[PDB]
């Protein structure tokens, strides 16, 4: 029948971390610039968004390190 479940979860990871994910990064950075004007600028806001991109992209390396193999 259909492909094994191991392949499908790989397709989601490839799609998320592909061209779609890269265009999500620029949208998050834009929200920082829009928020600093018409509001208040702080180090906590910029650190949170940039930290999110670091965790999101390259999450495969984080998963391998935490699990210990793969």
Ligand X SMILES: CCCCC/C=C/C/C=C\CCCCCCCC(=O)O[C@H](COC(=O)CCCCCCCCCCCCCCC)COP(=O)([O-])OCC[N+](C)(C)C
Binding site for its own copies (CB under 8 A): 1-41, 43-44, 46-68, 70
Q: Is 56 in the site for ligand X (CB under 6 A)?
A: no
CB of 15 to its own copies, least distance (A): 5
Nearer to ligand X, 2 or 43 (CB): 43
DSSP character string of 13-66: HHHHTTHHHHHHHHHHHHHHHHHHTTS---HHHHHHHHHHHHHHTTHHHHHHHH
Rounded to whole angstroms, the Cα distance separating 58 from 30 reads 21
Q: Is 40 in the site for ligand X (CB under 6 A)?
A: yes
CB of 10 to its own copies, least distance (A): 6
């Amino acid at each position: 029948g259909g492909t094994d479940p191991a392949t499908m979860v790989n397709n989601i990871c490839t799609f998320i971390l592909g061209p779609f994910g890269q265009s999500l990064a620029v949208l998050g950075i834009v929200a920082i610039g829009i928020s600093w004007m018409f509001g208040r600028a702080s180090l906590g806001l910029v650190a949170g968004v940039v930290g999110g991109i670091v965790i999101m992209f390259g999450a495969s390396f984080l998963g391998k390190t935490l699990t210990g193999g793969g």
